[PDB]
Every structure is written in structure tokens, then in C-alpha cells.
């Protein structure tokens, strides 16, 4: 079920759902989503370079042929925001959390056009998440970074954890190198929480896993 398309892959997980992929050089995967919503396309994280989100937008071309109207980006890395500019030189209007944007000229990122804030409870301020349609954006707190954010894919059993969730096999949480070692594991118990219905889990560095992914990554962090 993956299709490939230059050096990107494609999978979908939905009837309006696809995760893509992209790969930096071992060579590491980074794992984002595609959302078809009615007559327009809505993306969750870019890919490592502005070079590989081009051809995200060209996938879409080709395979959904409908505008993007939008992009999130889940935090101020390279695997989720290094393709900024990509969005940027084709006229779509970028979202991350105010915190990413802040961080992003430290990080070596383009800061997108926009910013996200949180209620105390985590979710989305829904004013500053314009036609966001199905994308329901939770910040769970710190964790794999201060600034990582998640998001659920309304009318689906997906929710996607980027960098916070790592699957139910994985032997570490790394990249920690940005990582609130304290809160990390109540951040990933807040995901779980926020999309409790949830069956699909997707995250950046593995494929789809259930929700065990969550409370795998919960009793690793309590290690930390
Ligand atoms: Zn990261």
C-alpha cells in the first residue's frame, strides 16, 4: 500500500487520509499527514527540506488534484518545519504554535505565517486555528520539545503524536536533545487523553501503531 513518488513515500490510511513520508541521511524517515477535507487539502508537517515538501505538493497534484489551503507544523525541527519555504513559495498559509515560531530562528527554521495558542487544558484557542476543518490541534505539554503540538483528524480513529509518541517497540525516546525530561510522560498521557477514542496512532519516526504506542512511551518516560 505505499506508493512512491521521487524519493518520497506515500500511504494511505484513510478515505481522506495519507501519512507521507520523507528521508534524511543511516538515512532517518519522518512521517507526516495529508488531509483531504471536502474541496480543499489540509497538511500536517512538512518534510526534511523544502526540496522534498515541493514534492509533496506535487503528489497532491497528481494524486488529489484539489488547493491546499493550509499546513501545521507540529514543532521547531528540521523532519517538521525544514520545508517551510516550500509552503511559503507557493502561497499557503502556515500554522504552528506561537512557542515553534519563537523558537524557530534558534532552530535554524522558517517560522510560520501564523500562530496557535492553548487554553490551560491544552486544546486549540479556536480563533487562532481559522478553518482548521478536521484538524483538532492539542498541546499536550512539554515533552519531546517544549513546543510540540499533536492533532487528531476529526471523523477518523487517527491521531498523530509527531515526536512526542514513539511506537511500542521503540528501545528509546530519542531525540531527547530538546526534551522536558519531567513533564514528558504526563505530555504523552494528556495525548492519550485528548483523543481518547483514538485507534490509529501516527507519529514521525515509525509506522501507525495502536494505542499501546502512548502508554509505551508514558513508561519510558516515568524512567526519565
Ligand atoms: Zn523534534
Request: hydrophobic fraction near 45%.
Amino acid at each position: 500500500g505505499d506508493q512512491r513518488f521521487g524519493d518520497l513515500v506515500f500511504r494511505q490510511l484513510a478515505p481522506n487520509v495519507w501519512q507521507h513520508t520523507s528521508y534524511l541521511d543511516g538515512a532517518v524517515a519522518s512521517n507526516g499527514l495529508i488531509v483531504r477535507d471536502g474541496g480543499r487539502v489540509l497538511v500536517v508537517d512538512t518534510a526534511w527540506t523544502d526540496d522534498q515538501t515541493a514534492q509533496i505538493l506535487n503528489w497532491i497534484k497528481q494524486e488529489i488534484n484539489l488547493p491546499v489551503a493550509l499546513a501545521v507544523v507540529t514543532h521547531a525541527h528540521q523532519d517538521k518545519m525544514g520545508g517551510m519555504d516550500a509552503l511559503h513559495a507557493a502561497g499557503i498559509a502556515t500554522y504552528a504554535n506561537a512557542l515553534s515560531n519563537q523558537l524557530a530562528p534558534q532552530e535554524g527554521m522558517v517560522a510560520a505565517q501564523h500562530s496557535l495558542t492553548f487554553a490551560a487544558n491544552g486544546w486549540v484557542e479556536p480563533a487562532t486555528a481559522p478553518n482548521f476543518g478536521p484538524l483538532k490541534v492539542f498541546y499536550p505539554g512539554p515533552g519531546h520539545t517544549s513546543d510540540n503540538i499533536t492533532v487528531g483528524i476529526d471523523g477518523t480513529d487517527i491521531a498523530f503524536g509527531g515526536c512526542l509518541i514513539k511506537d511500542s517497540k521503540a528501545k528509546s525516546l530519542g531525540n531527547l536533545g530538546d526534551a522536558d525530561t519531567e513533564h514528558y510522560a504526563a505530555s504523552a498521557r494528556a495525548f492519550g487523553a485528548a483523543f481518547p477514542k483514538a485507534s490509529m496512532i501516527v507519529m514521525s519516526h515509525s509506522a501507525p501503531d495502536s494505542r499501546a504506542a502512548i502508554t509505551h512511551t508514558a513508561r519510558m518516560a516515568d524512567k526519565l
